[PDB]
């Protein structure tokens, strides 16, 4: 059984992961840190892997310590840039046996969904994204939808644009344009989080739908990442490569 530490243990996600690690028989909780706890608590407790959902301003310092001490890191904290990835990559040159996974989404369905979308995108004339959320959601479209449409568009570099004969419309009917890909945002009481990618070509359509029916649906992807992170030395960006 692996020894797992949690950074950000009192936060919304951290406290959830503490409970998840305690429930899982194969993972033993080795340390549980929040703000102001020294990172040496992780080595004092023989931690092998850490789950980090902290804050963009502290995650770089934490990562330096972790990599330095041979502690694998599963990181959900956001605010990662190209420069930050570089820096992490450089720290790992010194520590070739250490694995760091930095991912913006740990829901397995969402991760598979994005990957399927990217793989299918080149074979169809048309692609559109539809996302549906509860009406308390502030941003339209969602981050996941906009990220998905950007991947689709990138996979479609050098294909013709979506065919569209629209010559009379009310404004807004055709959705938002995200790198040439229409994205539609439905806001409906009674929903949680849902996303459909639609692909079409004469004669056939393909749809990939992800439905998240509770806020904690990301937990198994984080546990999966903890159980597998050591299979890939160095930096992995996104959960997809651990899934393979």
């Amino acid at each position: 059984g692996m020894r797992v530490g949690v950074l950000g243990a009192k936060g919304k996600v951290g406290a959830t992961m503490v409970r998840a690690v305690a429930a899982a028989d194969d993972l033993t909780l080795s340390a549980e840190l929040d703000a102001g706890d020294p990172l040496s608590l992780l080595t004092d407790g023989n931690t092998e892997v850490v789950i980090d959902f902290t804050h963009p301003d502290v995650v770089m310092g934490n990562l330096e310590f972790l990599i330095d001490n041979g502690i694998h890191a599963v990181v959900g904290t956001t605010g990662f840039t190209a420069e930050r990835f570089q820096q992490v990559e450089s720290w790992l040159v010194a520590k070739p046996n250490t694995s760091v996974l930095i991912a913006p989404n740990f829901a397995i369905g969402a991760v598979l969904s994005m990957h399927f979308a990217k793989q299918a995108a080149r074979f169809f004339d048309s692609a559109e994204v539809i996302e549906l959320h509860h009406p308390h959601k502030a941003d339209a479209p969602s981050g996941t939808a906009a990220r998905t449409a950007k991947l689709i568009a990138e996979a479609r570099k050098g294909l013709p644009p979506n065919p569209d004969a629209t010559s009379t419309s009310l404004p807004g009917a055709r959705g938002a344009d995200v790198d040439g890909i229409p994205v539609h945002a439905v806001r409906l009481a009674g929903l949680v989080a849902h996303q459909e990618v639609l692909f079409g070509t004469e004669g056939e359509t393909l749809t990939i739908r992800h439905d998240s029916l509770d806020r904690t649906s990301f937990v198994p992807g984080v546990l999966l990442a903890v159980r597998r992170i050591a299979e890939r030395p160095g930096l992995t960006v996104g959960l997809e490569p651990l899934l393979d």
Copy 2:
């Protein structure tokens, strides 16, 4: 056994209805007119009901003749304004046994779907419409989606608006506003014509989806209208009242 005439018999929809009337055992084709044929061909053939898919510039003159001679009319021709409806209603006062049905949708699935949407609308916090069509379609949103959202909005008079906390958006993300109801138009190769109405309230959602997989799916609604139109004297707007719901 009914005697049925078709006006617009060489058009896309007219020629299709000619074939449909000929196939149906209980309906006899009595006349088949296109542009330049005199309307007296209808009475020379003892027409009881006419199916009219012509053009907004000729339908009012055809209707006057039909109503005047007691010939029931099933009309799919568009461009009908509130004033034109009022005018047809006024002609019928003189001819109280004549029936005229004017309808923008004859597909039974689409008609049912609109009627369900109107009935469900008062009972949910949220309503939205999604329509999906082949990418050769000129208008967004479609006439059917816009008409549906208008019915939903009318059924929701005096309820709060759709709840929406959206404070950051890219333009167009939330669709087009049709009388307070968002409408989203997907344009996708490989589709024909598709519409979903979504209703929601905390804890549950209800969805009504109509899929039309061929362009002639409207034919049974028109035949149904022809078979039933005489049951309702006067002007009927929309196919729903003849459905006997």
Copy 3:
């Protein structure tokens, strides 16, 4: 504001309805009874309407008292037969101003869904039902699905059967037969309760889908019934007539 009592106040549903009535500004909780409390508590507190989710063995006695004292009843308790409806009908002859609503389902979406299904059934060649539930569900198909298929079949009396050319099949592929209507039951981790009715005819299909994303989704139908029950004197069976 109406004065509402709850019978079965300590039960799963009752305790939920107590909270719902207390939250609603227009409804004032007048009495809150469980097993062993005398029904005179309802009249002592000037109750106008009672919500009753008790048990089939006690609901008939409760109903007699309620009807006798001019207290409208919204009843979710099950185990109602033709004889029991008759008996209720006869008690109401004496009390023509009293309203009693007995309903097997208070989720508005489920009630509308069944009604739409019944109204559409005669216009299509084919009808099938698909229901999807979490895998902890004991019964397949669900009660709602089987009830829905029976209504569809009744609305289809005197039409031809569903066309089906199936001549080679694995057994079970075509679902369960409920009065000539195929019903399919999906059991999937991550679902709550979902039902689709599918109708088809050459050239077109119509689908009516109900999704319940939490166990308390019936609450607004019960509150709706409490707010409207007085609009119909006598016995109403099912929530549909109050919706109209």
Copy 4:
């Protein structure tokens, strides 16, 4: 620029592929054979690739000739057993530059859908397949659904079975069992061919849906196979490996 022959040129699928090859600018029709035409017509016309949709009783003899003369083969003909596959593999050892693709589905949407299903299968507690077809369909479940469920089951070797507390059921409610995966077959007028794979785990679900709205939707997959088959020497089973995923 490739020279493409069609075997089975008068059949339903063969005649359709003849027209598709003629329309494509980069493929030249080199020969067009039906039953009773000698195979030497293929070599007399300098055929590089053949599309074969014939009949399980003739395809093995055709394949022998093709492989022997270095002609790549894209084969949609069914009735291929494990032993026949092994036999084709054995012929190709002698002809290491020849490529043969044998595939039960050429619709790109269907092929992708199966591949996604296989990739998602290990990561969810539950998997089920729903297929929907027009009511003239003879087999339930369809070959595609059964093949899909078999792939899912194989990807799930060594995981627990689908959780299911069902203790009371009407027969058939839970579908057909195909290697531990429930498959449900809907037969509905107005449909063509449709398949959904559903995966679930506490808190989330993932659905992959393929809709084919016409019977010729397989044509681009066959053309894609013809254009790429030479990239993979030897026997390829299924279209997926040529998709370059």
